[PDB]
Symmetry: C2
Subunit: 553 residues, 2 copies
DNA sequence: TGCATTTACGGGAAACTG
DNA sequence: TGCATTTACGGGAAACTG
DNA sequence: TGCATTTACGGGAAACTG
DNA sequence: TGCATTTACGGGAAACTG
């Protein structure tokens, strides 16, 4: 809350008051050297037409007041140093980290407004200290003597006031909108060759002489030494328009920003790399959007620069699954140090951490996360029966290695099940009709509930296509549990044709010459079919009305 | 062959950076076979090496040199230790 | 304002190259 | 010879312009 | 060949700097 | 203010040179 905010805020007011105060001291010293100027110029030449002492004890004030002002700036400059080091190395940086998790999902970033203010104030303040150190240069260019406080301190002050300004604006040059392909907006670091993508750059020092003065250029792969070093590094060019100027218009509420839309990638086919298909790394190699500008002004020549997160470049959205996986791991295990190498030797991760992303994945697409009992099934497919919340999962196990006894990676499994929900199961899954994830052990042992006629929902473990199914229970006459029952898993193909709910309504099972049954009555604990999934049902010389229907035996 | 440090402030020896002394460095070599019509440039490089001041350190260090030489093919991953494996 | 036409992209499959 | 990646095109929907 | 003298390094502790 | 690293020096052993 206002734990550090209130601290930092008090320190910026502090700076702002200590600039005002210096300015009253400049005005009273601007007066007292004119008064002496008047009284000395009528007294030096005076015989052309009770003791007292005005010329000996008052002149002292043109020393004393110059020492008080000069010492009083240094005190301000020291204070601005501390305020600035907190602002830069704590307040921005921790907004950053926040950002890198609003990529991969989770809690949303707050605005930049609060940070802009602190920036801007600390920058107007240092602009005012610049002018006052030039009114001091002007008083020295009128009257100078033996020990002049503003001749020993003139250059050390000027040099510090700039050294501070530079550091201040250079850190103000940030990326507001991490690059993204508009059509895939929860997936914002994965580029495709020959779609358009968009970025936006934000400057924090909202000054108004910085309007139509900064033209921000976009580069690709600038100063990436993996190109030379790694074997098989692709190269690419950007294609939209690169050069924009940064304007206070467009983006409302000031915000000296630039949003470049219509950015594209194309590959530079020049053999060259020769596309070695025995190098280090596949496509999980990382790349990097770079930006760059320069604040030109009378006496002021600052070079700005900044850089996107690591980005991944693909050809086909057959890839983008895999890719995203990259972008999770990275954004999950890493501070910022553009480790473009990461994946040569990629770390492990803590099942207590991974878990919270896995949640995030579904919570981002939909309106409902992975609850506890569902993570337990997953960690256990990753770890093994001892699913400590400290166990380490290796990046292979996650993404490029077949699980226990199946022919597909563990992400590439979840990747499909998410998809299925996003296009065929939103309602049932925002309204928690699906158990989804469960082991075909603690299913049976939770169906020794009720009426020979309860059924879960499950996602199937044995597809790669992601395919939902249902499980239900009978009475076998032996005085116990049934062999239970579950059905061949219902994938997209089927669900394309008739909706999953509607499968449910009208499930059959049949015989030669026997009336057909309906073994689905009660969903989990006790809920009548025709209640849970009531509300999704579709609808309730002259053609006759047909349906589709799912049927066993 | 000897090492000496180039004290020029410069780095300013930040004692809040990434990595301690397990940073890796690298001996590089280089020559050229000149001959009538033949002008070849040769080059090669040591393993990653670790540089210390005092053999109060060399324990720690060795530890570096185990991990690296144990988990790695050759690709001079000079970064390793920013994000070192298991 | 509405309709015709063009565009941009997703997705599947074949073509490429190491 | 097989697998990894890219390219090509069809369809569908959105965008554009008269 | 043997002895004197100097050298190089290991190790501990204090000094440095962020 | 504390911790990380470097530097400084003493001792011991080896090397060097007459």
């Amino acid at each position: 809350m206002l734990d550090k905010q209130k601290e930092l805020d008090s320190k910026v007011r502090n700076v702002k008051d200590k600039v005002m105060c210096i300015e009253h001291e400049i005005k009273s010293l601007e007066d007292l050297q004119d008064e002496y100027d008047f009284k000395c110029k009528t007294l030096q030449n005076r015989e052309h037409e009770q003791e007292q002492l005005l010329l000996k004890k008052m002149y002292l004030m043109l020393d004393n007041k110059r020492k008080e002002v000069v010492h009083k700036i240094i005190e301000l400059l020291n204070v601005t140093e501390l305020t600035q080091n907190a602002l830069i190395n704590d307040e921005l940086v921790e907004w950053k980290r926040r950002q890198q998790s609003a990529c991969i999902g989770g809690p949303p970033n707050a605005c930049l407004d609060q940070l802009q203010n602190w920036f801007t104030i600390v920058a107007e303040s240092l602009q005012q200290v610049r002018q006052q150190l030039k009114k001091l240069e002007e008083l020295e260019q009128k009257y100078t003597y033996e020990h002049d406080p503003i001749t020993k301190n003139k250059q050390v002050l000027w040099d510090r006031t700039f050294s501070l300004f530079q550091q201040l604006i250079q850190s103000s040059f940030v990326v507001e909108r991490q690059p993204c392909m508009p059509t895939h907006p929860q997936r914002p670091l994965v580029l495709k060759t020959g779609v358009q993508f968009t970025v936006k750059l934000r400057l924090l020092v909202k000054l108004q002489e910085l309007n139509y003065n900064l033209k921000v250029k976009v580069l690709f792969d600038k100063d990436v030494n993996e190109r030379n070093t790694v074997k098989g590094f692709r190269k690419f060019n950007i294609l939209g328009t690169h050069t924009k100027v940064m304007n206070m218009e467009e983006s409302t509420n000031g915000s000296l920003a630039a949003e470049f839309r219509h950015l594209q990638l194309k590959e530079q086919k020049n053999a060259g790399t020769r596309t070695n298909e025995g190098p280090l790394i596949v496509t999980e190699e990382l790349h990097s959007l770079s930006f760059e500008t320069q604040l030109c002004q009378p006496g002021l020549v600052i070079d700005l620069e900044t850089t996107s997160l690591p980005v991944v470049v693909i050809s086909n959205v057959s890839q983008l699954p895999s890719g995203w996986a990259s972008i999770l791991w990275y954004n999950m295990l890493v501070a910022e140090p553009r480790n473009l190498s990461f994946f040569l030797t990629p770390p492990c991760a803590r099942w207590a951490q991974l878990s919270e992303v896995l949640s995030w994945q579904f919570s981002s697409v939909t309106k409902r996360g992975l609850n506890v009992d569902q993570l337990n099934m997953l960690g256990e497919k990753l770890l093994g029966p001892n699913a400590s919340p400290d166990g380490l999962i290796p990046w292979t196990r996650f993404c490029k290695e077949n699980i226990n006894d199946k022919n597909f990676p563990f992400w590439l499994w979840i990747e499909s099940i998410l998809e299925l929900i996003k296009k065929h199961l939103l309602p049932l899954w925002n309204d928690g009709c699906i158990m989804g994830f469960i082991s075909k052990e603690r299913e049976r042992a939770l169906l020794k509930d009720q009426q020979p006629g309860t059924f879960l929902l499950r996602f199937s473990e044995s597809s790669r296509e992601g395919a939902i199914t249902f499980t239900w229970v009978e009475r076998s006459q032996n005085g116990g549990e049934p062999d239970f029952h579950a059905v061949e898993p219902y994938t997209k193909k089927e669900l394309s044709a008739v909706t999953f709910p509607d499968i449910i309504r009208n499930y059959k099972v049949m015989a030669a010459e026997n009336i057909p049954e309906n073994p689905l009555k009660y969903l989990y604990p006790n809920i009548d079919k025709d209640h849970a999934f009531g509300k999704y049902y579709s609808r309730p010389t002259g053609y006759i009305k047909t349906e589709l229907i799912s049927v066993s035996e």
